[PDB]
Amino acid sequence: EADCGLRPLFEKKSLEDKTERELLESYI
Amino acid sequence: DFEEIPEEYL
């Protein structure tokens, strides 16, 4: 979708939630 | 233990 998956309170403001790094770190 | 929701939605 056009604006899908970009959270107003996080991605759109360049703010990370507290555990998302855990996900990204598993994508080896 | 659900709080009463507005009657308008029922």
Add this chain to the structure above:
Amino acid sequence: IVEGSDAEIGMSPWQVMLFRKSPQELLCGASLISDRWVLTAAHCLLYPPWDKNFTENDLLVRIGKHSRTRYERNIEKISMLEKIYIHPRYNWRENLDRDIALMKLKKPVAFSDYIHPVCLPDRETAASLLQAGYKGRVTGWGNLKETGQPSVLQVVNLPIVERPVCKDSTRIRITDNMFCAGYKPDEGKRGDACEGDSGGPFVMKSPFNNRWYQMGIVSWGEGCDRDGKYGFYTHVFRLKKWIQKVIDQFG
């Protein structure tokens, strides 16, 4: 969610709560995929063995929530359903194969800081992300233990498990329309979905475009967080042809 933690506000703006009118209670989780469509598990609506067969009038969709039981005035939006569509080949007789359903809202909800749709995956994203070892995230207001319920939305990050391991953990016939996730008993960490979480999203964040995609739907499991057992999820991409078909044919 067993062994998860409280979600941050606005963390899963696509999380939806399936709410029963009478008696007023939580039925299942769901997800917002557009301003008018909601995705959930078919078993949340139809399960003949337990005489469950909910229609449009039996339910309410609650969007933008954080608290499980509180009416979040000025924050959440409640919507009525126009039409429910269950996958014609949903297999409730044997293994819940093709456990998916779409719900068309009566009128579009307006997006906000707390309400925003998740993306459905494309072939390439599914191909690159749906790999054993990669972690996804599940959210919901379901039980905290197999055995109460949380005050607010819970979240847990779980790794996708190798198909053979999924297969060897159950007597149930696993299909290509399902995938399983969770930690192996020797990994130290744990966690899983539980009753009430069904129908909710299993999402992953793409490292290519930074968007969140819904790879699965909480479908079934044997108990909750049992060692040597894993959570089973509907493979959303495999059933995408059906999703697309229903949307452009019905609105």
